[model samples]
Target: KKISNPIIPYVGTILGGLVPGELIVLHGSIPDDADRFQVDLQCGSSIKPRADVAFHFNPRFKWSGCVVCNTLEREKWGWEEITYEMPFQKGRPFEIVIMILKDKFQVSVNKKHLLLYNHRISLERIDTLGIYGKVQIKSIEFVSN
Candidate 1:
């Protein structure tokens, strides 16, 4: 499959992902100035087109297998959008670890599994990685913990 999708102009980037049983250690922050942002794994230097994943933090939390599919195709994992309701705070840095087991997507944000997305993409061939949108990335890394 052709792997080429221009990064969408940013509006914000306060998003994250995780898979059950996989250990992921991360530490970082986004500036208060960031109006929009999105942290994507598929865009990591190369496009890994297919990925089984999900995200959390937004009350009414949910996700699906296709970012390309229309709105209807987007999967939604039941959740409450607490972050969306909370007003923008200052110096709210982010950090945590994630474990992707075979069955569940264990997610840890700031140090806990606040969210989860069961494997969806099923295929692994994304070739590009990027932090889309206009926001400052203090740090974001994943390593075995």
Candidate 2:
């Protein structure tokens, strides 16, 4: 499945839940004045009470840069796992590929390995994809195993 030129602050159903060996590919770029952006794999799309987020991938372009990964359950966030290496550059196009594995999510940016996030919530529970903040996206593709 694929989505082209989705508007920012986008939220959509995953269609079928994710599985190990599948890939989630995002083609996008960063705004010149961007501060941060987030991509979340969530259990559902709930706002008032907030649904659980299985994986929260956030990139912050402050004081150099960093990527923060975490989980949110029952509206409470877990400890953050941060990576200080920045693969995204402001005003530049990027390709982010998230490879699903049995135990973790492997993410790569611009064709280079970025980080690994251990699964805190099971993959079967994630039914939505949410993207928010300062970024431009051209396409989002899901490749089955």
RMSD of each: 9.5, 0.5
Quote the positional error of residue 120 for candidate 1 in Å. 1.0
Over 4 Å off, model 1:
1-21, 43-89, 123-129
lDDT of 1 by residue, 32-95 (tens): 5554444443422322443312332221112321112111113333333233222222346665
In model 1, how large is the Cα lDDT of residue 137? 44
| Model 2 whole-model lDDT (C-alpha atoms) | 0.96
- Measured by C-alpha RMSD in angstroms, how accurate is candidate 2? 0.5
TM-scores of the candidates are 0.47, 0.99
Clashing pairs in 2: none
- Candidate 2 structure quality by residue, lDDT tens digits, 35-108: 99999999999996999999999999999899999999999999999999999999999999999999999999
Looking at candidate 1, what is the lDDT of residue 103?
52
Error of 2 at 83 (Å): 0.2
